[PDB]
Design a protein around this ligand. Structure first.
Ligand SMILES: [F-]
Length: 228
């Protein structure tokens, strides 16, 4: 039996992302558009800073910029919380600690509007060093593969997620960003609370050679695993 949630993701789905950001008082907005193809775990998105120059490095926003698009193997379908919350959606909250620097806190509401999967995000960043790796833009425009570890948070009717990102600094060192995440359904309906597993991510960051606004093209593949 295919759930209503699953059924919404069987083909290519347009995506709209809207973010309002304030990091150490530097305010900015970003919009993104693209499409997701959950059958293949494939995300293709282009983001544009609509307020001018982005005040932080684009790579620090990659994790913020729709896990309902992950490819869950058939044998793990009972563990896909993200799709089971659709179309009413879910709220994703994170705190991202940059080691030896500031922190982002984010709140993202992810839901369908008609045929478009929409994500509305607010990001607040505080305690950054104005000449640290983030505000001083010292991070390379590239990205590593990682695993993201998901567990049920039964008491919250949602999930708890942890993981670490290691951003390459331009001197060959690394800027650790420790992510703590939780997701909770927006609706009151039943959702799938998963056994422990993980999502395997691969990301490639690129530029649109015809685009003059500050922007990032993101191509990401996401696959659930760890339960066999
Ligand atoms: F999420």
């Amino acid at each position: 039996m295919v759930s209503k949630g699953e059924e919404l993701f069987t083909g290519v789905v347009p995506i709209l992302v809207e973010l309002d950001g304030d990091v150490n008082g530097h305010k900015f907005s970003v919009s993104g558009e693209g499409e997701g193809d959950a059958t293949y775990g494939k995300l293709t998105l282009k983001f544009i800073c609509t307020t001018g120059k982005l005040p932080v490095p684009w790579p620090t926003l990659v994790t913020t910029f729709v896990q309902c698009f992950a490819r869950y193997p058939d044998h793990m379908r009972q563990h896909d919380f993200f799709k089971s919350a659709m179309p009413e959606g879910y709220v994703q909250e994170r705190t991202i600690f940059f080691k030896d620097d500031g922190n982002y806190k984010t709140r993202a509401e992810v839901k369908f509007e008609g045929d478009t999967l929409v994500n509305r995000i607010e990001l607040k960043g505080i305690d950054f060093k104005e000449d640290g790796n983030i505000l001083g833009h010292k991070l390379e425009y590239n990205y590593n593969s990682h695993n993201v570890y998901i567990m049920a948070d039964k008491q919250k009717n949602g999930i708890k997620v942890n993981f670490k990102i290691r951003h390459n600094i331009e001197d060959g060192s690394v800027q650790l960003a420790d992510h703590y995440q939780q997701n909770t359904p927006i609706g009151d309906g039943p959702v799938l609370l998963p056994d422990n597993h993980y999502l395997s991510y691969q990301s490639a960051l690129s530029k649109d050679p015809n685009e003059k606004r500050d922007h990032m093209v993101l191509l990401e593949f996401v696959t659930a695993a760890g339960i066999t």
